[PDB]
Symmetry: C3
Subunit: 388 residues, 3 copies
């Protein structure tokens, strides 16, 4: 977590055009959270002294949610509005408009569309920054395909010189594969000063935040880039292709953590587990399964195949097979499926049975009660050990 007097700016003002969506980019959803929700969670964990989200384009619709999140995380989150889209640098300049004019602390600039960004990466950033006592630290990474991203230019001694954006690069600089991750740490005084000197001269007619690296190099200040090996943690999201690739890479990591904690997952590539889901030891998840939202599964269960559960509580030793359910509970040792539909409000007691072609809506089903097949049970209370 964070030394000491630290302020983090989350930049979320972009137009998000390439998503091709009426829903603002950062609100696009991923393993149970919006990209923005992930990024604010990761950041809050470190507990900066300040947390500033720069909203732009769609602030109207994003703002409410930041405050919604601000409460959840029991912490204050500031919102700065960038008026004109006059570039990422201007965005930072807007961010700063929300700290006192003489905040002495370090500044960490990150983005709203890097949902994989984690605690360690961020920490390491400050550790390096303070250690090498840098005026700026920028996180980089090496990609197989560097299109869209800005390129890190280095002389022979591996020393940083400047960052040149996709649009502005020569065709030879496009062959460069080391990219700007868009996560920074700044000496605050050394930042303000550098932003004052940015020109919109070339070539998206804009004020580039990247331009700062070359300015400060010329200033005579110490300019460190820190290479992040695991690109995933630092990858951005501009289109729905990247959104899916990252949804995939995060899922893989969520499943792995469950596997390493005692859950058999027969097919990780087709088992989808949202971030809040809990699962007990020696549970088996068969292929084609989504466990979404607040779903908790106990130990020694069998879930799947083809099972989707949103906000479902599942006891120990239950079996939930080919079921589509939500906002329900399933008791210890209960048997549900195949081809069962649990609508919200279904509470099925321990060792209850819900068989094939059974739909339950808003019903309490007592301990040991069987509903064997082809039945709708809606808005009803059923006693224990009965038979429907």
């Amino acid at each position: 977590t964070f030394p000491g007097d630290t302020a983090v700016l989350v930049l979320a003002a972009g137009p998000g055009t390439r998503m091709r969506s009426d829903t603002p980019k950062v609100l696009h959803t991923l393993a149970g959270r919006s990209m923005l929700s992930h990024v604010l969670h990761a950041i809050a964990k470190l507990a900066p002294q300040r947390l500033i989200v720069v909203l732009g384009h769609d602030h109207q619709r994003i703002a409410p949610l930041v405050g919604e999140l601000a409460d959840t995380l029991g912490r204050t989150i500031d919102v700065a509005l960038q008026d004109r889209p006059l570039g990422t640098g201007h965005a930072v300049l807007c961010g700063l408009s929300a700290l006192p004019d003489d905040y002495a602390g370090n500044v960490v600039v990150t983005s709203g569309d890097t949902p994989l960004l984690d605690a360690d990466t961020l920490a390491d950033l400050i550790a390096t920054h303070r250690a090498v006592s840098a005026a700026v630290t920028v996180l980089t990474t090496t990609l197989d395909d560097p299109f869209g991203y800005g390129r890190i230019l280095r002389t022979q001694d591996h020393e940083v010189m400047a960052i040149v954006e996709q649009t502005d690069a020569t065709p030879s600089q496009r062959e460069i594969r080391e990219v700007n991750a868009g996560v920074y740490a700044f000496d605050i005084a050394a930042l303000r000063s550098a932003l004052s000197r940015l020109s919109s001269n070339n070539a998206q007619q804009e004020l580039y935040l990247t331009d700062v690296i070359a300015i400060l190099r010329s200033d005579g200040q110490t300019v460190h880039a820190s290479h992040v090996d695991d690109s995933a943690l630092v990858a951005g999201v501009n289109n729905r292709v990247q959104l899916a690739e990252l949804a995939s890479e995060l899922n893989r990591r969520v499943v792995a953590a469950h596997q390493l904690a005692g859950v058999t997952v027969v097919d990780p590539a087709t088992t989808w587990i949202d971030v809040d889901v809990t699962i007990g030891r020696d549970t088996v998840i068969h292929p084609g399964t989504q466990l979404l939202g607040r779903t908790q599964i106990g130990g020694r269960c069998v879930v799947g195949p083809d099972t989707t559960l949103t906000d479902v509580a599942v006891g120990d030793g239950a079996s939930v097979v080919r079921t589509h359910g939500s906002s329900s509970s399933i008791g210890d040792g209960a048997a549900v499926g195949p081809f069962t539909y649990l609508r919200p409000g279904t509470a099925l007691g321990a060792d209850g049975k819900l068989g094939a072609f059974v739909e339950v809506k808003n019903s309490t089903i007592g301990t040991g009660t069987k509903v064997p097949h082809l039945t709708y049970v809606g808005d009803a209370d059923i006693g224990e050990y009965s038979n429907i």
Copy 2:
């Protein structure tokens, strides 16, 4: 599209033994089209002056379909029959039997089993061929595993010498990884001449089309090979293993195009979209979904998970979840699924509901009509805003 006086021969005469199937190889199906259908579509788009499909082995069963396709593409397609399987070169010689004896135009020889072959690749071929004013241009590619394919031999100056087939290669030439793609462009006069000189001497006792590259090299004519980086576009299909790998690579590209045009696809690896399918902006497709045939999905929909739709029209803002349907329409704002079965003839109006364990056959269901669960509706007309 095609300069100018151009004739393309599609070779589809092979025995297709390794498919191990009673259905001829090129008729094997892939994202809604037979390999042959893909290849004739790609080719027709460029509009050669002539289009000749060389049929052999199974011509009896393939021919009808070429003429079926010939109509669809509003264009004439010629069929040459190769009698004996006396080699790929003989096949070309058969192809030519369908042009006038003095056709002056260039000849493009491609194959029936390269379903990924696209417009640009083909164009580039002629552009290179005419530019370097070649007697022959052959397309190559580099593979991780070059088994089965023929090897490109090059001296130190990267200059082509000959092509040596899987069977005939030394074991050291098998270490070579650059392969013959089996797509060519020829100077017509320089082709005829070279084929006359082919011998069946070694080692599948046959007349190899590949043999031409070495002959023309000796002739003193200009022999260019053009390396294709994206192997996929140029990969062939000899067994069902390759068929699936290519079905996969094409799917990935179909999904990506949808993603980049505003469709959220949660899991591309398990979402299958045939080539004709249309999908509207901000639709979400959940995992385990096949959209097959002429299926069109509007905007702001939710399809999936576990949904298969063949030739289904789906309005804007409909939800189609765990449904198996075909030859049906689903109205704007309609709710179908989970566990719903739409047989051909189902027409469900705007804001209609078809609930769990409901099967509809050949029925009109009017606007706002609910069928909540566990019901068969067959051969019926139901009024608007009614309740079943």
Copy 3:
């Protein structure tokens, strides 16, 4: 298969802690067999003169099954019990306690958690061992990630010196990527002698079997390591992450063999086929399908999508779509699904139909009998060509 007087020790005494499971590691299940079942099958095929499984930790629960397997494979399998977990070397020393004190034959030491280990790999091992007339042969492999495994140390002439375990390695030796596979072949006399000299001095305070390679090198005896290119065949299983990766790699190979023998499998990554399953020519398996246990599918069938069948017999030309069934038979030309549930005891004759939302339990359904939708048929006999 095996020369001549050969004895194989299968080591299965580990604590298996990293599985994090109440079920002993080697009993963890994989494509229809426990890891131990796979390994004993592969080994029995070669027909060693002796077969010794060293049980430790959980012998109580594993032993019965070895004898269960011993019968199936019509062959005797010996069980040696290792008392204290005093290391892998001690385990071997325990293994030997079950051969006569003067068994002259070669000894092959393999592990219980390498379920992919095949016939050829094993053969090649002895072929090399006898050919180079080695005192020990160890199988190695190169990994992208060598964590957990023991490292092969080689001087400049590629000659083996010693094997250093994960725990005991310097941080520079951890950069080494060539790993000990834990499959060996020994000259028996040269083994006994070397084990006598093992010390528990460093650093898991234990008797390492690996230590033998360095001892025998010093002895002056001939020490060969044989690199296995296909790591999969030789990969071990310590956690559920590896279990799934291997379940995946084996599946891929099972599907490929079916594809190459005439079965169309649209999506191999999401089609799961246990090892005993048979499938006929020109069958098509659609995505999301599991064929488990003793399931046999005839030719020209259609299975899937979303179909799970455990121990189901399926005739020629049947269609089994969106079905969840087990211990049942489905006749030639029969139509089952979508959303059909076959419980054990279901026998559906040729050209029978079981339609949507139909569950069958323990019933005989005669030739040409239809059960069109939304029906339970339990414990019943139905005549031919009838209608339910």
